[PDB]
Design a protein around this ligand. Structure first.
Ligand SMILES: CCCCCCCCCCCCCCCCCCCC(=O)O[C@H](COC(=O)CCCCCCCCCCCCCC)COP(=O)(O)OCCN
Ligand SMILES: CCCCCCCCCCCCCCCCCCCC(=O)O[C@H](COC(=O)CCCCCCCCCCCCCC)COP(=O)(O)OCCN
Ligand SMILES: CC(=O)O[C@H]1C[C@@]2(C)[C@@H](C[C@@H](O)[C@H]3[C@@]4(C)CC[C@@H](O)[C@@H](C)[C@@H]4CC[C@@]32C)/C1=C(\CCC=C(C)C)C(=O)O
Ligand SMILES: CCCCCCCCCCCCO[C@@H]1O[C@H](CO)[C@@H](O[C@H]2O[C@H](CO)[C@@H](O)[C@H](O)[C@H]2O)[C@H](O)[C@H]1O
Ligand SMILES: CCCCCCCCCCCCO[C@@H]1O[C@H](CO)[C@@H](O[C@H]2O[C@H](CO)[C@@H](O)[C@H](O)[C@H]2O)[C@H](O)[C@H]1O
Ligand SMILES: CCCCCCCCCCCCO[C@@H]1O[C@H](CO)[C@@H](O[C@H]2O[C@H](CO)[C@@H](O)[C@H](O)[C@H]2O)[C@H](O)[C@H]1O
Ligand SMILES: CCCCCCCCCC(=O)OC[C@H](CO)OC(=O)CCCCCCCCC
Ligand SMILES: CCCCCCCCCC[N+](C)(C)[O-]
Ligand SMILES: CCCCCCCCCCCC
Ligand SMILES: CCCCCCCCCC
Ligand SMILES: CCCCCCCCCC
Ligand SMILES: CCCCCCCCCC
Ligand SMILES: CCCCCCCCCC
Ligand SMILES: CCCCCCCC
Ligand SMILES: CCCCCCCC
Ligand SMILES: CCCCCC
Ligand SMILES: CCCCCC
Lengths: 156, 1034, 144, 48, 96, 48
């Protein structure tokens, strides 16, 4: 890859805002990815660093960047209940109906971990409620199996 | 007692002979080692779970064992690691003085009861309970030069042919193999398996049935048919012995009639048990033996015994096999004993030259030359009774006591010579008077010196053990010396010394000795006149004294304090650290670079490089490795530029520009398990079931705060690993049940193929060895290969993994740490330049109280001990001081006079600190013990001046100044004679730059420097102390 | 008599008997202990705010306090006055029989779906040449 | 209910227990409290 | 159980004996493997050696070998205890 | 049996030196010990 690309990956993961800032000034590749295909946005979306997510998207970071298994930053943000990042990403053109290699959408993951607030945001931006994975299971199917009544109520 | 043995010199000879024989016996029969057991007892529980992750190992093994570690006596703390290499390592540290055998059986017995709670696979591999020892006598590397054998082939040879013979060798306590013997490796093929509708399950089932021991019975066994003629054992099926036999294992018979064998679906070869460690020696494939010395064994004997075993093994070695010695402590030990022993003989020779210079008769030069060795031999006899070994610590503890030993001999003889010259008494009559003057003082010194040193043995922990070696050794020699001084030397002095005419001071002689006698006598007059002028203006010297005391307190604080000086041991290590997720090949390419460097740019110094890929002290993995560099002889590396210190620095520099790798070189410490000084060991504890992530955030929060105090803390870092990307695969239960695929088959198929699975054992050429089934490399490398694996459903159709699974990337721990049963994260760090370890630790403690709720902390290792050994130093210093005062009070029969002696302490310590500071040395144990011996001799000198002076005043009714001047005049010669001899005795130690010069420098420098100030100052300052004190208290 | 050696000698013999016992009795954990018959002390634990029940407190003491006291030198035996929590599956025979299931089907399913699996690694040793990926495979884990 | 190991010191063991409990208290949930309804060691200290 | 002397020597006796090294005050080690499949490994120590500590050292070093043994041998059980060759007495019992 | 006979020479040798030095110390002589230790063969031949 590059020298600064590795620094950005390591810095974006740790949530070191002032090191990410210097790196964005120096022109560290935002499209830099490790072996599993995770860009600094993935790492920021995963570990829940809101300030950095915003900074990366400003610096021409790919919002719909997918890994070697087809997962996006929104997949990660939605799965680990990072409501602010989810909203920021959806605002900056994150594909709400992005399927991974398993056909799992950010709604499926949000539903499985039962993040009620996040499920409503995705639904606000037009998440397909009838989107099936490789096993024909919807976000509704997950809620009923998980036994989350409140979430089952939101998906009618 | 002196009077008794003057009349009975033959008795004195018998006691001398008995001591000499007892000691001579002890010296040959005593065990030789480098260092004794310093570290407290630690029992380590080790287990392997093949292909298990950090969390699986922890949750199935580490926790289940820790919960069962109850009812074990004298446990201080318990710590464990659970890593993604499938290994767990639970260490239990015990109280110093605990029986390590009892501590091990208690831990091991509670594990046996926990065994049924562990997984089948963990019970099958086995959980090892061993005693912790990080001290190898030597490493024997085994290489192959004609590129015919691999490291697995070499390792099997060593296991089968050499290892057991080396284990059986005299003095060998333990032999650890670098690698594993052969294992029957079945490398499975998903394509071939799926084609014949078979799974890893079917392969395991067939191996277990067709590679087994089957019990039959007996022909004509009891109870028989009465009239039976023959009884014979029936031999049924027995274990397979070859790859050929394993390949013929029948998995399936087809309809057409063709047979599906194990060789049809898998590759079969004698490989290694695991492929994590790739060991190479100078680029070539290597293995070898880590040999440890047995309890109470001779290290030089064992080393010689092992070499003679290997010497007669060479004939049967295959083509290209060679034995190499990357590491051997024996040459370094043999050097230390010799240089220590050499110093004691030179020291005695030097007294001969000095004794003859002043006394100028060969009969007086023999009294010390006889008496000192008797004490040195005699000391070894006492060490033997304490269960001690001849080691660097005791050998140097003995060298440091030379000044005290040599003095006991000189003081006794000189005084007899003086009496005969001044009073003209015959030898026997002169000795009675001479001994009558000092016999009470000598006993008084023994009690005072005992009170200085005996308390030093009562320090606890690791460092308390190193102090106890010097304590007993020095005390034991000093006790024998005083006994010999009262018993033997009086008898020799009364029988051997020739009579002297009254007022014959050798001024009547001619030549060199005539000049010398006339010269020294004028200088004694110049000296006494000089003390006379000082005693008129005493108040001035009291101000000059406080300048020394303030000069002492300054250098004392300024001087950095280490434990033991580093040594050019002919070896050092280069630690290689690639980023997280880096592969074996990538690490190998850097180690190849590191080896090239040492064999290219340092081809003059370096003999060999032992590159070990996949091993790291901070945690194993494919992205870590250590290159252990073995140099040539010290003789072929001349000057400071070709030393381990100089090479280490050059190497670290050159590897600073290695791309995507943290590579640095460093020397080994004198003691392995002592760490560094000003270093601390912090444990962050999860006390409220937060989890791994919340504890990471807490650690990160503590680390960030520590980084804002660079003036107190430096190098505050975690000891463990960071979270790495891991491949999460979710098995769909519903789809599996729908397709008729069982979870047991899915789980076995994945674990067996990707992780490997230990099935059972087989006998390879009369040695029981293990059988592993694993996927061939190319089918378990990437996520795409998961869907290439098929499982057979109940209805018979073959289902790929893709059909009933779903994968995603997440972050997880490759190394989960636990402290005292709870989750933990070890933080290493140290005190900033000029800060004490206690300051840093109180700050870390303070920062830690501001962490999130449910996050505790604790001190472990050295920091645990420091806290405990720090509470003791006050008591021992205090007790030691009180008893000296009390012993001097009984001798002088005065509460006040003792102060005059006790006030000499700073005069010896000031020179010590000057020499150490100006040579660029540290406040290490050798320096510290050297202070105690310097103080002892200067205090001993002071005692006899006060005694001589006091008895003049008490018995001859002489005046204060009159008695003082006469006293110092009488003690000038013997004091100068000891110093002259002793300073010359330790002069070679200060300038020695050879092997083991680090220790010699620490002994010689702080003694010479201290001896120079203690001699020059004390002759002028003791009369001042005595006069000022006597004037204060009438 | 040296209690250390008495415990060692007794347990040595028990270890021959251990395999002959039922699997169930081995899995509950057999314990050899060298203690007094009488209690040294009783460390009672209550909740002053009455926020935690008898069962909640008991579990806290067992899961957080009991093991460290048990590992303390001189403590021959520690008796919990209560019980540590377990995952309690309370079976309904009426509902079991309705779906044609038994406790054997329940036990078997808990074992298959409450399992911690050793699943190996991607790019694990011995690897192919030009391997850049090294990651742990995480299959099923213990239910929480 | 704590029982004393064979031949162990009751006072020294009781001291070590109260030391281990002292390190746990800081991380208790809200309401949890240690009470000493039975102890044989306090009598030995007073009697001596 | 059911294994011949040679099969038992290769799998038990040698495996154990290899781990019977670096034991304090060991004079010699005699052992035998019979047709029934029994393994006796007698370690005789120096005179004055604490037999209780000697037993503990043998037990600790054996339990390293225990997992390397066959699992059928582990299930049958392996004992470590102090021993003597000759009988003090034979207490005979008869029916009149 | 082997052990017992190997160490017998060293036992006699040290025993004689101990008895010798003990006499020298007690009687403050070399000649009295030497005089007394010369009788040892007169005794030993009778036992043989
Ligand atoms: C006024 C005149 C005199 C007044 C004051 C005189 C005071 C001193 C003179 C009395 C001498 C008597 C000595 C008695 C020693 C008592 C201790 C016994 C030894 C002991 O228990 O230690 C074990 C000895 O075991 C063994 O069997 C190992 C060998 C060691 C046995 C000791 C023999 C050596 C010499 C001892 C006598 C010293 C006196 C010489 C002046 C540990 O040892 P281990 O088994 O671990 O062995 C490894 C060696 N590193
Ligand atoms: C199992 C291992 C084997 C290893 C062997 C170990 C060796 C053991 C060592 C034994 C020691 C024996 C030493 C004896 C020395 C004899 C000296 C002869 C002198 C002699 O006969 O003259 C006497 C007078 O001497 C005098 O006037 C006094 C002379 C005093 C000088 C003494 C010199 C001692 C030298 C010791 C060397 C050390 C040896 C090594 C350990 C006789 O007259 P008298 O006084 O008897 O009769 C009083 C009348 N009025
Ligand atoms: C000549 C010289 O320098 O000293 C030599 C000479 C030496 C001091 C020897 C060590 C030791 O047997 C010595 C004793 C006291 C041993 C006990 C008795 O049997 C004595 C009769 C013997 C006389 C001197 C001798 C034989 C030396 C050594 C020791 C070497 C050891 C190692 C581990 C390298 C030495 O060279 O350092
Ligand atoms: C003037 C009085 C001075 C008194 C000094 C007395 C102290 C002597 C120090 C102890 C050294 C003697 O102790 C003995 O040394 C010899 C060295 O040949 C060692 O001998 C052993 O090591 C050497 C090392 O090269 C091998 O070659 C040899 O095969 C082996 O037997 C013994 O294992 C050790 O027990
Ligand atoms: C409990 C253990 C610790 C105790 C403290 C030990 C410190 C004391 C050191 C030893 C003291 C020696 O004590 C000293 O011995 C010698 C011989 O008896 C005496 O010396 C004197 O002896 C007699 C008197 O008896 C005189 O005729 C003679 O002129 C003179 O030699 C001193 O008057 C006495 O004070
Ligand atoms: C700087 C490196 C040297 C380090 C070692 C030096 C420490 C020892 C120094 C002592 C040297 C002797 O110094 C000694 O001092 C006293 C005064 O204090 C002198 O005495 C002189 O002054 C005093 C009063 O002050 C007069 O009563 C006397 O008549 C006169 O001679 C001695 O004549 C001199 O010899
Ligand atoms: C002669 C009057 C007393 C001399 C000093 C007695 C001190 C002995 C205490 C002791 O046991 O030493 C252990 C100690 C461990 O750190 O060993 C040492 O560190 C060496 C001695 C330290 C020097 C301090 C005294 C000089 C300052 C003015
Ligand atoms: C081990 C040698 C024995 C020492 C015996 C010394 C006796 C001293 C006699 C004292 N006295 C004052 C009466 O002479
Ligand atoms: C732990 C072993 C230490 C044994 C101490 C015995 C010391 C006695 C020697 C006395 C001879 C003067
Ligand atoms: C650890 C306690 C050791 C006791 C001190 C022994 C000093 C006597 C030396 C002869
Ligand atoms: C006459 C007094 C005996 C001297 C005792 C010496 C013993 C030394 C103890 C360290
Ligand atoms: C002017 C200073 C006088 C110093 C002379 C003292 C000589 C002492 C020789 C040991
Ligand atoms: C505890 C140290 C002993 C001090 C006693 C000094 C007494 C002097 C008063 C006359
Ligand atoms: C560390 C144990 C040593 C105890 C022996 C005491 C010697 C008098
Ligand atoms: C006149 C003073 C001379 C001092 C000389 C001392 C010799 C060491
Ligand atoms: C003679 C000093 C005794 C030391 C005890 C701690
Ligand atoms: C058999 C020899 C005995 C030795 C006597 C000095």
């Amino acid at each position: 890859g590059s020298d600064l690309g590795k620094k950005l990956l390591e810095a974006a993961r740790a949530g070191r805002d002032d090191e990410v800032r210097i790196l964005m000034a120096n022109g560290a590749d935002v499209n830099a990815a490790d072996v599993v295909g995770w860009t600094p946005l993935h790492l920021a979306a995963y570990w829940g660093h809101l300030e950095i997510v915003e900074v990366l998207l400003k610096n021409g970071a790919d919002v719909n960047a997918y890994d070697t298994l087809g997962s996006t930053p929104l997949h990660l943000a939605a799965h680990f209940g990072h409501l602010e990042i989810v909203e920021v990403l959806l605002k900056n053109g994150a594909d709400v109906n992005a399927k991974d290699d398993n056909g799992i959408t950010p709604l499926h993951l949000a539903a499985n971990r039962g993040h009620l607030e996040i499920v409503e945001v995705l639904l606000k931006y037009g998440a397909d409620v009838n989107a099936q994975d490789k096993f024909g299971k919807t976000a509704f199917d997950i809620s009923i199996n998980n036994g989350n009544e409140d979430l089952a109520e939101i998906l009618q | 007692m002196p009077n008794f043995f003057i009349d009975r010199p033959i008795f004195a000879w018998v006691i001398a002979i008995i001591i000499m024989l007892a000691g001579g016996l002890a010296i040959l029969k005593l065990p030789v080692a480098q260092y004794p057991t310093i570290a407290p007892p630690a029992v380590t529980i080790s287990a392997s779970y093949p292909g298990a992750d950090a969390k699986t190992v922890q949750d199935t093994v580490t926790q289940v064992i820790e919960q069962n570690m109850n009812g074990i006596d004298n446990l201080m703390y318990m710590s464990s690691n659970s890593d993604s290499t499938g290994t767990v390592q639970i260490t239990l540290t015990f109280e110093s003085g605990t029986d390590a055998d009892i501590a091990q059986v208690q831990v091991q017995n509670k594990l046996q009861l926990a065994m049924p709670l562990l997984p089948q696979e963990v019970q099958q591999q086995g959980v090892s309970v061993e005693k912790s020892s990080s001290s190898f006598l030597m490493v024997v590397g085994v290489i192959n030069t004609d590129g015919t054998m691999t490291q697995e082939d070499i390792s099997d040879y060593v296991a089968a042919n050499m290892k057991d013979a080396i284990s059986r060798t005299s003095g060998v306590g333990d032999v650890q193999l670098f690698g594993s013997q052969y294992a029957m490796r079945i490398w499975m093929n998903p394509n071939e398996l799926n084609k014949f509708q078979l799974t890893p399950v079917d392969v395991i089932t067939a191996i277990k049935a067709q590679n087994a021991q089957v019990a039959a019975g007996q022909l004509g066994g009891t109870p028989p048919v009465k009239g039976q003629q023959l009884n014979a054992s029936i031999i049924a099926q027995t274990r397979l012995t070859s790859t050929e036999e394993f390949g013929k294992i029948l998995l399936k018979v087809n309809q057409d009639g063709s047979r599906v064998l194990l060789r049809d679906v898998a590759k079969i070869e004698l490989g290694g048990e695991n492929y994590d460690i790739i060991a190479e020696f100078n680029g070539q494939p290597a293995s070898g033996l880590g040999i440890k010395l047995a309890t109470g064994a001779n290290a030089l004997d064992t080393a010689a015994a092992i070499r003679a075993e290997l010497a007669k093994m060479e004939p049967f070695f295959p083509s290209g096999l060679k034995i190499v010695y990357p590491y051997d402590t024996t040459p370094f030990v043999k050097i230390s004993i010799h240089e220590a022993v050499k110093t004691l003989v030179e020291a005695i020779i030097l007294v001969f030259l000095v004794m003859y210079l002043f006394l100028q008769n060969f009969r007086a030069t023999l009294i010390p030359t006889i008496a000192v060795p008797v004490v040195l031999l005699g000391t070894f006899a006492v060490l033997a009774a304490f269960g001690f070994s001849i080691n660097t610590l005791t050998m140097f503890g003995m060298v440091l006591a030379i000044g005290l030993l040599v003095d006991d001999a000189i003081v006794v003889v000189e005084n007899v010579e003086r009496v005969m010259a001044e009073e003209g008494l015959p030898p026997k009559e002169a000795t009675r008077k001479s001994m009558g003057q000092i016999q009470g003082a000598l006993v008084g010194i023994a009690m005072v010196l005992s009170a200085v040193f005996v308390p030093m043995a009562f320090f606890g922990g690791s460092t308390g053990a190193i102090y106890r070696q010097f304590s007993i050794t020095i005390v034991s020699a000093m006790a024998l010396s005083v006994l010999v001084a009262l018993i033997l030397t009086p008898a020799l002095c009364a029988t051997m010394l020739k009579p002297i005419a009254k007022g014959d001071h050798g001024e009547g002689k001619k030549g060199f000795f005539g000049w010398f006698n006339r010269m020294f006598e004028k200088s004694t007059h110049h000296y006494t006149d000089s003390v006379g002028g000082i005693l008129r203006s005493t108040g001035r010297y009291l101000v000059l004294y406080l300048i020394i005391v303030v000069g002492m307190a300054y250098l004392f604080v300024r001087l950095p304090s280490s434990f033991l000086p580093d040594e050019d041991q002919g070896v050092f290590m280069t630690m290689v650290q690639l980023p997280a997720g880096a592969t074996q090949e990538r690490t190998q390419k850097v180690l190849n670079e590191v080896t090239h460097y040492y064999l290219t740019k340092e081809k003059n110094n370096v003999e060999s490089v032992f590159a070990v890929n996949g091993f790291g002290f901070a945690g194993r993995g494919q992205n870590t490795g250590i290159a252990f560099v073995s140099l040539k002889d010290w003789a072929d590396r001349p000057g400071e530029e070709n030393k381990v210190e100089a090479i280490t620095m050059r190497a670290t520099r050159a590897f600073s520009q290695i791309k995507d790798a943290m590579v640095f070189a460093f020397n080994l410490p004198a003691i392995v398990e002592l760490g560094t000084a000003t270093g601390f060991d912090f444990e962050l504890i999860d006390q409220a079931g937060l989890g791994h992530e919340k504890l990471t955030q807490a650690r990160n929060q503590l680390l960030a705060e520590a980084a804002k105090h660079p003036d107190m803390l430096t190098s505050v870092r975690p000891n463990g690993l960071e979270d790495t990307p891991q491949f999460k695969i979710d098995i769909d239960q519903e789809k599996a049940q729908a397709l008729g695929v069982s979870i047991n088959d899915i789980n076995t198929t994945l674990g067996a193929a990707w992780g490997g699975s230990y099935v059972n054992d087989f006998i390879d050429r009369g040695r029981v060895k293990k059988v592993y089934v694993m996927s061939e490399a190319k089918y378990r490398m990437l996520p795409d290969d998961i869907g290439d694996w098929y499982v057979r459903a109940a209805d018979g159709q073959m289902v790929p993994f893709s059909a009933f699974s779903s994968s995603r990337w997440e972050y997880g721990s490759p190394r989960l740490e636990r402290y005292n049963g709870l989750p933990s994260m070890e933080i290493l760090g140290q005190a900033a330049p000029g800060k004490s370890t206690g300051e840093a630790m109180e700050l870390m403690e303070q920062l830690a109280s501001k962490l999130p709720t449910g996050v505790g902390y604790d001190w472990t290792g050295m920091s645990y001990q420091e806290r405990l050994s720090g509470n003791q130093a006050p008591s021992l210093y205090a007790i030691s001081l009180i008893v000296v005062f009390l012993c001097l009070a009984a001798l002088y029969e005065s509460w006040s006079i003792p102060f005059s002696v006790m006030l000499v302490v700073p005069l010896g310590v000031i020179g010590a600190l000057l020499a150490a500071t100006f040579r660029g040395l540290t406040n290490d144990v050798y320096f510290q013990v050297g202070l105690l011996t310097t103080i002892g001799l200067s205090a001993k000198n002071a005692i006899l001046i006060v005694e001589f002076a006091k008895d003049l005043m008490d018995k001859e009714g002489k005046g204060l100044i009159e008695a003082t001047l006469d006293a110092v005049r009488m003690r000038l010669r013997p004091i100068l004679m000891t110093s002259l001899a002793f300073i010359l005795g330790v002069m070679p130690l200060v300038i020695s730059t050879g092997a083991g010069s680090g220790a010699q420098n620490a002994v010689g420098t702080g003694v010479m420097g201290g001896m120079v100030t203690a001699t020059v100052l004390a002759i002028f300052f003791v009369p001042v102390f005595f006069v000022v004190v006597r004037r204060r208290f009438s």
